[PDB]
Structures are given as structure tokens and as C-alpha cells.
Design a protein around this nucleic acid. Sequence first.
RNA 1: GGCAGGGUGAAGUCCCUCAACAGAGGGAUGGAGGCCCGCUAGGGGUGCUGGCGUGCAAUUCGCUCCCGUGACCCCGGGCUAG
RNA 2: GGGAGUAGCAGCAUAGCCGGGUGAGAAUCCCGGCCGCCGUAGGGGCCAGGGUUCCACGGCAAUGUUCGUCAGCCGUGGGUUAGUCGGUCCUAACCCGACCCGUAACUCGGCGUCGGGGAAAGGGAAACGGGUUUAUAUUCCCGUACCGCGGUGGUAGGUGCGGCAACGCAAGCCCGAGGGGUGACGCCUCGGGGUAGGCGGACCGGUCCACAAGGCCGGCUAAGCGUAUAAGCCCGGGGAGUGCCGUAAUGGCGAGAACCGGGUGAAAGCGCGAAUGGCCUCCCGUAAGGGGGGUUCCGCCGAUCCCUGGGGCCCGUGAAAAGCCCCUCGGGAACGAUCCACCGCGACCGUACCGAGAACCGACACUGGUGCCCCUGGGUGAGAAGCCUAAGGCGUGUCGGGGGAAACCCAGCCGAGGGAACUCGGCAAAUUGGCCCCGUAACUUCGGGAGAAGGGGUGCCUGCGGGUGUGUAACCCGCAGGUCGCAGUGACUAGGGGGGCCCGACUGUUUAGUAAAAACACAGGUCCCAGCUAGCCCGAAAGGGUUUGUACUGGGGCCGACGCCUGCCCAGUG
RNA 3: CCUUGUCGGUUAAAUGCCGACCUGCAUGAAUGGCGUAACGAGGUCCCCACUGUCCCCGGCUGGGGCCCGGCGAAACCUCUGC
Lengths: 237, 84, 62, 146, 89, 50
Amino acid sequence: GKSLIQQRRGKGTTTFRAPSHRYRGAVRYVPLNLVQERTLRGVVEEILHDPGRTAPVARVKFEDGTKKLIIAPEGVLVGQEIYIGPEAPIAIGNTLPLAKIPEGTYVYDIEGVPGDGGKYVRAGGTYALVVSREKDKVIVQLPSGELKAFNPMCRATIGVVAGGGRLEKPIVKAGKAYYIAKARNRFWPKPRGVKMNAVNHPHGGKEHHIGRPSTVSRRAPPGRKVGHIAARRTGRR
Amino acid sequence: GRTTKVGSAGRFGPRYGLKIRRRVAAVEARMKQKHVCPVCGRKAVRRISTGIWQCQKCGATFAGGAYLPTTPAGKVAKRVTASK
Amino acid sequence: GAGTAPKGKRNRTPTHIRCRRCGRRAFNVKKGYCAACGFGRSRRMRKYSWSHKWRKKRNLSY
Amino acid sequence: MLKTQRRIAAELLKCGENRIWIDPERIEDVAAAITREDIKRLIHDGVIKKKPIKGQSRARARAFQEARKKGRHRGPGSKKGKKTARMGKKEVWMMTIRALRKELRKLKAEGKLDAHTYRRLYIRAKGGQFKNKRQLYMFMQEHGIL
Amino acid sequence: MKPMYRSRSWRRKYVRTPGGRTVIHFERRKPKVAHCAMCGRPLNGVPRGRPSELRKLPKTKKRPERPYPNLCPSCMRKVMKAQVRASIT
Amino acid sequence: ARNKPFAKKLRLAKAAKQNRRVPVWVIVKTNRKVITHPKRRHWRRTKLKE
RNA sequence: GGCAGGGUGAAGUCCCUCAACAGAGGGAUGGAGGCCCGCUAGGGGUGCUGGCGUGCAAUUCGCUCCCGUGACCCCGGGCUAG
RNA sequence: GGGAGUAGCAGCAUAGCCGGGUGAGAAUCCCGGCCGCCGUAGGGGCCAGGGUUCCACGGCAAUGUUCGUCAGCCGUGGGUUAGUCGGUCCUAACCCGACCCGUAACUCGGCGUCGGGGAAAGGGAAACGGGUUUAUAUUCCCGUACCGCGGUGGUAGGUGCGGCAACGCAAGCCCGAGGGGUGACGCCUCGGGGUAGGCGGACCGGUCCACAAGGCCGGCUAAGCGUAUAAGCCCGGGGAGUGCCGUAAUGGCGAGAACCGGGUGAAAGCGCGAAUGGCCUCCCGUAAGGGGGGUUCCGCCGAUCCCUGGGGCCCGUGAAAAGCCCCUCGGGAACGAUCCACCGCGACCGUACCGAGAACCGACACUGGUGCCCCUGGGUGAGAAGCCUAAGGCGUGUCGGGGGAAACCCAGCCGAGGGAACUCGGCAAAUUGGCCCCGUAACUUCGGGAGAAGGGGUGCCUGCGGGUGUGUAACCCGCAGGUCGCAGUGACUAGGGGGGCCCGACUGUUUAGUAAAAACACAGGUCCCAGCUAGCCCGAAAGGGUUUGUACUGGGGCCGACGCCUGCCCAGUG
RNA sequence: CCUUGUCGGUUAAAUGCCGACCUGCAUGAAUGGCGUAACGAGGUCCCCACUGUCCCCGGCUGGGGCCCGGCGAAACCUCUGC
Ligand SMILES: [Zn+2]
Ligand SMILES: [Zn+2]
Ligand SMILES: [Zn+2]
Ligand SMILES: [Zn+2]
């Protein structure tokens, strides 16, 4: 037969590739190497829109003139002083190890293993909650409802990510959706497989209907995983 | 203000449906008005981009919500972090 | 349609130009290699057994 | 042959070739002329001339304009565009309000208005209730401003 | 018109010749005025020009004679006052 | 005015020099056995390889 | 690198009058839109089941019709190969 | 060979006639005149592509849909001149090499490091006018300039000033470092200041017109050098709320308004260049050549060209680097320029012509395509519309001559009485039509429907008033009266309307070449997997896409704007 | 399916269109059900106006066709041809 769109995505062509050359740099923490226990200080110069971040970034000038990017917290001003390190105070925009952040605090941009740089709760409008502290692990509620354990030396930032409420206003036009999907080149517009031919999809045929259950095993090979993949249930409730 | 029921959504006529027109008009009417600055305390704050707000008199520039400078989670975080 | 009219759009830049090693017009100008001798892709000559070109050039039997 | 002379003479005389003239009693002398020297000599003599441009008078148009200025040819049967297209929309307002503000400043400088009345009249004019200076003056007279 | 002059980065001009020809001239565009480092205001005393126009000028005709010409007078007074107030002890 | 690479220009010059007929004394000397050669070419019938 | 000219008139910003427990009327400014007319340029291809059908043409011509500031049209440099 | 001396040499731009010439020979070549076509392209300029088709002389065996004395054909000789135009320099998306890992191996596959390439329309030192040739010219000659490098001699300065300030100044040399600016940016909309071009009046010359009145032609000024204001932004004084100040509009003010002064700061214009230079015209032998004159003023419109400022939109944010200017610091010598004057030097390649109804691709001197890529005078007029016309180009959208010479076909005009009886079907054709005023339904998502429907008027002449404006300048808005015709948006331009039903919500897309749709997409609704060494995917592996990403996220299905709703069954298959 | 189902309206005349009735061969709720303003070179029925569509055809214009000069093919062809 012929290939699927998700099979063609794996080969890595311009039709499926991200235009990262349009984006501001990557957002990472300073390494622990330079922050053994130094507790640097910085000042915010400017706040900027990023086309590949779903959140605004802020530029910060540090001890030695170095300029870094950060995910901007809600409420941050130009001309603020932000601190990174163990003896930093508890204030919106400051980065601390999870072992110095009390229970009940809102946190974002958390590391999985220390030194990583930031992996979880980065998206516009998100926040996480510290639930419990211990000597072996700290426990955090994530925006999916999942409770996860981190090493207490993993770093995190205090506050909430800026840019929330994007989805309260509707997209009204195919043209606006065109521009939105062209910013980050997502595959748009989207076809339906039940309206393709048989060579093209497990669905497909002159009579436009799925002729067998949409639920598909976890152990099915590529070319077949379409529909509801390993679904525990279906329907509304 | 010539219209009774419609507002900023009169730009695209009888298209796209009632619920959607209402929602757009409401959001835009809440957004486009002026807001109080957290620095000088005057109603001079407008939106510059998605999530970036600026006062016209003092020049204060801060990060906030997409369509309103504040969010509920932001309010609660401010309160909790001020106390503890 | 697909015939006489599209033939008018052959005033762009050419797909092949002359090769410095081979001599003939088979050097792909955008990829940087020759389709007849391999220049720009290999130090050695392009030479396949199913081909008749080099045998013809040397007046050889197939 | 004579195309050479025609084009060279057109270049030398700064005109079109369809505006050059060659005397038909001299085609042998003109064919014997191959150099630009020879061609310039023949031009100086008068065997090759440059005809004048043909004109296209505008004297019918002059008369039409004079009659229209004195009031003819401007009735409901001669208009093809809309009224807003024949006279602007924003231009009318521009000229009106500029005239009004100029006149108000002139009066305030000559001393017949104080700042309170000047300001109230400024605000009225911005609101757009006068539409000309005679209406402004009438309002001022029927109130107690003068 | 050549394709390089069909570019709109050349600001053409119609010019009449003593011989009466009305030729077209082309020029490059002038760069914009200098701005302050922090405030972003336009600087005074610094003229606009391309490298050609600016290299046929002496030094003292390219910036004012006062400290911190890269700044506006307000910012300059600020930094001077801060320096002198730090230089008390 | 019209932009050319130099080696291309030289190849074109050669192709132009090539395009003329057999001289007359060759025909006389061969007794009418050599009259043409295989590189006559008109600019509007058979194209070069650029 | 491009898209003649014209229409309608959203938000935003206001003015006047009588008033007055309430309210009731009347005038402007401003220029949005996958809006409108349009053989501007440009693009497309509905009907005549027209001409042609060893053709001007191995898919063209004419009349009629559609879009025409946008999910628009086009150019130079690049990428995806049975 | 027959078909046949037949078809075709029409249709989309119907074009030739008179006189003279050349020549063996002229419907078809040259000169003049009359008559015509194009005229926001059939005119002008120039990419790619082509490659000598360019120029002159001499020819007509073949080519050219006919002829040909002609020629993009044939032959013989010629022709492309740069310190300033472009390439070379920078980097963009992207590509290559070496090392490295994989592969039985490779001319195969791949991450990271180093290095190198990558734009003749992106960034980016520097020249304008006149003349000259058969054919080249911002390249040659004359005149008047500029840029870089290297020097010669002086000077500012080292070791100096004026201003409350904003600022104004010639305001030291040589190496390196750091910082700031510039280069450097989207879409829509509006104001101001200018220019190209055009219109009117006077005057000077020439020309056409039975006189007169009148009409047409010409009346020019480059780079460079030197000179200023506008907006905006600043500096001093000043000291305000029942408020004042201002814009086309938004607006501004004790976080310092009005008001008074000043600084900085565009495109332009003015002056030198530069008037025996260019254009126009007037007088004797006509071979070189002689002499003389004119080159003036006012007033309007005005860009899609140039400069400068505001405002609005983004779940969308609209390049980088070289190069250039300034400041600070460190280290050196005692000299010495970013100022004035003079001298010297500046390599390599391109440069002819077409640029398309005959120089490109399509087998052709092909109604197609590439390129409409950039630009265009007057009238009517909303208008880059259609019609007429100036410049410029053509009569080569390369066969002609006859005719009451029919039938029939192609493209058009008119038709008495009736008015769809025609036909599957009002197919086709016809009707309406521009502008101003009156008047305007059901239904409705209150936005629309709507130019609904329907009705009345419009020319020419003689006058009277209004608006802005200094205007007997220009552009617009009304009134009365007189008069002609079958007919006054008189040509050109230029909607036939209404009432029901099915489908699809709409704008959009589709079977290049028999299907444009009820089919696709769409905003939106709902379901599924996934806490990152994840989920889904490519690959033989190494490695890789989503990922410069982290649940307001990424991936996978179905329905399909909006409104009211979405019932029962887990036995089977999963 | 029987089917031009039956009743009503539209015609002088109705295998049509619209509205209802249920005997649903073989409708039915996100393979969505029922409605819907605005929009459509979609499909279908009626009315006004208008007309050479038609009764019934007629006259005129330009280019071909016909003749003259010139250049000059092809498809096709067992031999023939009441
Ligand atoms: Zn503020
Ligand atoms: Zn080769
Ligand atoms: Zn500043
Ligand atoms: Zn400042």
C-alpha cells in the first residue's frame, strides 16, 4: 500500500520539520558548575514574544554581563532583581532548590534530575503545587493531576507562567488557523481517513465507514495504529 | 455605539454564528479598555503583545495574562507567597 | 494543459552544465556532481557493466 | 541603404525616423552619403529636414471650460460619478473645521472673545453644529457674544 | 529598467538634462537617526548619513562636546549624580 | 550588459570560428571530392550545448 | 516584486436642545471586514454542448460568465525520488 | 504512381492608391503625397535564454506559404576599450570536506567538532553632462568632480576656547581590549512639506488659415561644492483645575500645562558649475564655410515619485553578518592629524544585438507559453474603463485580382399581427441599465435582507445665488426663466425582477486534456495515548523526526457554523 | 417495489411542483436527528415583463464558397464499378 502521514513525518522532511531558525534561543538554567553555592544576582532588561514557546520570555543581565533568557513569570517588571541560588529569597521569579521551598508554594520550570535545565510546567499559564517534603524526595502535583517525586536538589522557579487564557477567545477563521499553523509548521489542513481510498488508510473505501472496531492493540505494528490506541474505555462518561 | 446587541463583532456581519460572535465581543470589550498600573496607580495600561502589558504615562512594562493583565492563579500565588 | 504550453517555461537556469573532467553537459549545477562521470561525488569514474556508453566511446563489443 | 541615412539623421536630429524628410530630387546625392560628415553636410544644406510636430489644439476645451465656469454643462444629465466621489467626504470636513478654528483664533486675538467662550465655541465646532462661518456668526449674534 | 533597479531600495528620481532628455537617477537610502542606549530617545547633535557622507566630516562635527554622548542629557545627569553620590566615603 | 563566464565565451568563439564552408582551393585540389564538412550549423536550426 | 477607480460605514471618540421624579429627541467625527461593483493589471474556466477539429494549436479562438487586500498572484535561491 | 494541378494559402489587427526611380525583369524594393491601424500597448527600457542573428559592400542556385532587384538567407571584410556600472567581499535557508560511528564493504548512511562554500533584484567605498563611429560608450575625447592607498609641506592639538544649559567649535600620533549606535526590517489607514508632469494668460520669433478672428512649434540647464527650515525630540524661564491648550482623528498637563525665548534637525530650493554648451530662427558665392539675433515673465492643478510624522491588527511578532561612526580603558614615543595645498598608483572577467503575432521553448518566420518584468501626453469621464486623438511605431498579425456571380456555410442588423403555442428544459436572443429625489415587504443569528420591490426627473441657451479660498484664480453644491427634437446616462459606458422547494452553513479547493458538484477543507463539538531515557514515527545499524519543544503541550480518530436535542442493549466481535 | 399511492391547491386539459394522510418492500438520533437568517456560474416549480424560440418565414451587411494568375500536399487505393 501507500504510506501514512505519521509515517512520512519520521523521515524528517521540510513538510514536517520545525522552523527553529525563526525562534529565540533555548531556555535553560545556568549550570551547577558555576553555582556551587555562589547565588548570583541579575536584572531584567526586556520582555519578548517568542514564536516557539507559547509563553513570553525575559532577558536578564547577570554578574559578569552575561545575558540569559528565562520563561517570564506573571507580574515580572523590567528593572527587577531576580536571584538564583540556595540563599535566594522566596519571591516571584527566583530560582531555588526544592529543599528550600515550603509546602503550598506555586512553582514552575522544574528539573527532573539536577543540572538538567528545566523540563516540566513550561507552557503558558501553567503551575505546579508542592505537596510534601522529605529527606529522600519532594512530591509535587503537576498540571495533569499526577503526583510526582523529585530529588530535593532539583531546581525550580517560584510563581506562575505568564500568558494564560489563550483559549477563551475562539479562532474564527480558516485563515487565522492557517497563520497559526504556519507559525509552527503543523500539518494543516487535515484529511479524514474514512474518506481516503484503501491504499491510503486502514479505513477507506467507496462506502465511507469504519468496518471494524476503532480500538487498536498496543502491540499492533506501524501502519495500523489509527483510531483509539489501547483505549481503556470509550464514550462520553 | 450604533448597535444594540453587537459590538466589535459587527465587523464581519451575519457570519460565524451567535455564540461565537458574543464571545469575541465580550473578550475584546474587556481587553481594549484601560487598566490600573501596579507602579503609578493610574488607568493607563494597554496591551503590547500576547502576554505583555505597558503603561503609557510611566512606561511600566510587565508580563501578564493573554487578554487581561492578571489571572486567578496569579492572584492566589501572590497572596500565598506574600504570607509564607 | 500539460503539453505545448508548459514547454514555454524552459527559460530558467539549466539543470546540467559542462563538466570539467568528462567534457559533456551532465554536471548537475545544484547538487554539485556529474551524472556521467561522478565528478564531485567520487574520485573514481562512474562505470557500470549494464551501460554501453564507455564501450561505444572505445569502439568495444558489448 | 537609405535606412542608414534615415536612422543616422534621426539620431543626429533627436527625432523619430517617421519624422525625417528626404528630398526626392536628390536620392542619388543621399545614397552617395555614407559618413556622418556627409549626412551633416546634407542636413546643413537642406536635403534632409526634420518636419514639425503636428499639434492637437485644445481650443474647443477652452471654450467648454469657460462656459462651465459661467454655469453651463453641469446638470443632472452630465454627472456619471457619485456625489461623494465628485466632492470628497473627509476633505469637506477638513476645510470646514480648519476655517472655523482659524477664524476663532483671529477673533480671540482681536479681543472679542475670552477664554471661556473661545473654549465653549471650540467644543461646539468640534461637535459639528455650525457647518459654516455664517452659521457660526448667526449663532454668536442670537446669543450674547458678538 | 534593469532588475537591480526594479528593487525599491533605490528611490529613483526624474531629472531633466541641459539637452532636454529627462533621465532617471538612482540613489541609496539614508540610515535612520541615532538612539539612546537605555531610553530609546533620538539623539541630538549627531547627523544622519551613509559612511560616504560621514567620512567627509571632522570628528567634532559628528557628536556633541560633553561626556557620554551616547546618552541623552537626562540619563547623563543621572549617571553623573550617581557616580558623585557613590564617591562620598 | 549581458553577463558571461569567460570559459563559456571562449567555447562560443570557437564554435563560431568553426562555422564556415570548405575553401575553394581545397575543392580544386581534390577534384570535387571534398565539398562539405559535418560542422555547418545555423543559429536557428541546431542548438549548441551552451 | 505586484494588485485603476468607486461604494457601505463596526468598534473607539464626542456635540446640541428641552429638561428633570423620570426621560425624550436630534447631529457629527472615525475607517474595520477571509464585505460589495468593477474585461485596472492579474488569475480562473460556467454555458453556447458555438468556431476549429489531416487545426494557428498533440487542448487553441470568440462571445457569455467567476475571483479580484487575500486560505491572493508571481519571481530568484534551496529541500523531499519510485 | 492514382488521389490532383485538387485541398489549403479567409475567420482572432479586412489596406492600400497616385506620381517618380532602380533594374533584364517590379501588385510585393526605394523617395514624396493622400488614406489608414496601435495608442496603461503592436510605443519606450531591460533580465533570463539565444550566440554573432550586429555593421557596410556585393548577390539571388536554394530558404521566405506567392513575387522579389528585398531580407534574421548567401559571400567578402569589420565590430564589444571602465579606480567609480556589475562580479570578487558578508552572511540567510542550505551544501561539501577531514576526523568520528555504522556498514561484509562502498562512489552508501549519519550526529557532534574543526574548516570551507552559498545571493549579477538581500547587505554592501567612490562621476555627471556634452560630443565622437558604418557598428562601442556613465568605458573613447573635451569640461567639471569624487574614493582608497602611499607620500611632500604647513596647521589645529600635545601645552586651546565660547555658552546657565540644550549645544558650537579644525580640537594630537601608534598598537590592543571593552561597550553603544548604525547596518536592521510585517500588514492596514491618515495628515503635512515638496517634485516630475500638465493647464491658463502676456511677450518674442517662425508657420497654417479668402481678410479678420484664430490655431500649432520653440522659449533649456546634470553630478559635485557651499547655504535652512518643517515635523519630531530637547534646554532654560514660567507656575495652572467649576479648568485651560491643541488634532484630519486619537489626545496633553504639579510624574509640571498655558505663555516667553532658544538648540538640533529631511526631502527640496537658491548660488557657482555655465553659455559663442543645447534648441529656434535670419542673411551672400555653396566645397570647405562666413556673419547676426532670441533663449523673457506671472498664475493654477498635481502624483502610484521623494521626505517626514501620527494612529490601528496579531493564540500570527515580520533575518543575520561583514563593514562604518562614537566613547572609555591599558600600554608606548615626543611629536603631530578625521584641517589646508600638491604629487603618485588603481590588477582580473563582462560590455555587440533580440528581448518576442520572425532573434527565447514549443519539430515551423506556430493566434500558445516565458515577460506585463519596469514605465507612459490631450478630451469626455468616478476612473490605468470604453470611444476619439498627439508623440513614437507600423501598412510583414507576408498570396493577390474579379463579381448585382447564384445555392449553401461562418460572424452580424432589421422584421407586420400574435407573444413560449417551440423545446427534455425559455437553450439562444431579447428586456433592464449611469446619476439625483421619493418610497421600501416577509423573515432575521438584529449584523442583514436592500441597489428589495416600485415611481418621477436629466439636453442647449440667458441669467441668479452658495462653500473653502485674498482672489471676477481653481474645484464643487443649488435656483429661475426661454427654447428644439420621435427620442436629452441621445453615441460609448451601462443590473431583467419576484415567489416556493431539495442540498450544502458561509469565503475557499478539486478529476492538467469529456465530471466544479450535493464531493474535499473550514471554524467548532467530542473521544483516545502520553510526566520526557515519555507517547507516535524513520532506519540494516549508527543515529534521527515531533524537539531552540514539556499536558493552555505533542501525537491519533469521528462529526462538521449556529439553535433545540442526542433514547434502549456489554450476549457476540474487538 | 405495487406507484401516475389517496385527498387538496396550481391548468381548458398535470406520469409535474407544492401541502397533508401513514399501508416506513428497505427512516431515525455525533456512519448524527430535526430546523435555520445570510450565501450558491449547484438542482427543481410558478408569476410579471420581454422577445424570430415558434405560427412562417423574409430582406440586407462583411468573410468564404464560384472564375482568373501563382505555389502546391495528405488521408486513402486487390482489380473494377447500372
Ligand atoms: Zn503606571
Ligand atoms: Zn563528468
Ligand atoms: Zn536616554
Ligand atoms: Zn530619558
